[PDB]
Symmetry: C2
Subunit: 249 residues, 2 copies
């Protein structure tokens, strides 16, 4: 129709230099995940935030390297890397699930080292840190661990089915840092925190996500999204998460 012309396609984008970016958003994947979980994010947030996803060792082009199964050496390796590339200034942290727990721990570790503190902390699909330890799913078989991820919405793809087998070590090593973790009591963070729950998620229920509140002194908001533990892959709530991020950034 003359009234409703179809919009012209957005011209392909030159992504900002993480050095030359007003803000940098440091993104942590879920257990068994890679940097592809944050495919498309740069486009959806614009040019005032450079999206810098973190690829842990044991996956992608780091398949030959050994994955960590212990949370604090990992958190310490991560902070080393950040300090070694001047990212710990005008920056914030996103983590989903294991990435959330990992995000928090790296936050603490940069405080102890007296690194310039973060602007914001985002955590989705993750219970409060003190609540981590009771599950032991990294000790399962494969078919059990497959079905657990399936019932949480992690794999239905069938391409994924292929990639699942291959990344089982790295999953197990990711999940072990979450279940052998027990929260060393420590003070609260001064930065502001935003936590995302999902309605169809058992592993991060509202009350569990609510439990993050006393983990910080600054402003705390719990947004509540629809969908499951794995909403982040695609759908209406991945879109909403991204829009909420855009408002606080």
């Amino acid at each position: 129709s003359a009234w409703f012309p179809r919009p012209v396609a957005a011209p392909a984008a030159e992504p900002p230099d993480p050095a030359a970016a007003p803000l940098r958003l440091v993104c942590f994947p879920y257990a068994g995940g890679t940097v592809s979980a944050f495919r498309g994010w740069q486009e959806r947030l614009g040019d005032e935030v450079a999206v810098v996803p973190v690829q842990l060792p044991g996956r992608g082009l780091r398949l030959r390297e050994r994955p960590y199964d212990t949370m604090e050496p990992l958190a310490e390796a991560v902070a080393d890397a950040l300090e070694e590339h001047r990212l710990t200034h005008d920056y914030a942290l996103f983590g989903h699930s294991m990435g959330a727990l990992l995000a928090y721990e790296v936050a603490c570790v940069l405080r102890r080292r007296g690194a310039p503190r973060p602007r914001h902390l985002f955590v989705s699909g993750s219970r409060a840190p003190h609540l981590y330890g009771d599950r032991a799913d990294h000790t399962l078989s494969d078919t059990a661990l497959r079905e657990v991820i399936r019932d949480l919405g992690g794999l239905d793809d069938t391409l994924g089915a292929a990639y699942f087998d291959r990344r089982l070590p790295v999953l197990r090593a990711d999940l072990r840092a979450c279940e052998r973790y027990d929260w060393h009591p420590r003070p609260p963070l001064d930065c502001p925190t935003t936590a995302f729950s999902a309605a169809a998620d058992p592993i991060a229920t509202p009350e569990m996500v609510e439990a993050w509140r006393p983990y910080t002194t600054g402003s705390f908001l719990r947004r509540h999204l629809p969908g499951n533990h794995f909403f982040l892959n695609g759908g209406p709530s991945r879109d909403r998460l991204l829009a909420h991020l855009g408002t606080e950034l």
Copy 2:
């Protein structure tokens, strides 16, 4: 370094008739659907962005433009029904486009059509506060300087000003000669957007939208001038805010 590989630069736009939601968008005075370029990409695939091209511009350049808000409202409503876009929709409008959106909503309810899921109004005073100005009467250079000073000249406004001067006048007439005829409040939730450096649509004037709906009202304040929609931090913020309610 291997910790931070630079991601791969990332689109098939959903069918208006299929999508779970339509977001019908109205530009400001003497603006085109160009102001909504980039939107679909930023808002995702659960919503089909449907910019509305009013007569008088773009490929409609030689069609005669509407310059009264009510007949414009009726033509638009006819176009929306005729193309089966009257279900699962929301309206957005910046400045003049907000008023058009509000009036279109009112026409649709009158006709029995299903009501919109949301009404988004940006950079616009409340309906009854329209009618005080006379920018559409100014001389060519005078009017140019007004819009130039409000931040309204990429977009091609600057490039295609003289060519658009006739639709600028017509669009501004429809706002500046508008006298709100009483009707009941809408029922749909409504977000209103105002900008900190905007002398034309101040917070006081934007807050006044509140009683025009029985649903919930939220105002979001953002940095920049009257034409904040066009680019920059303020545009991103606007899109993100839109995201959270669609």
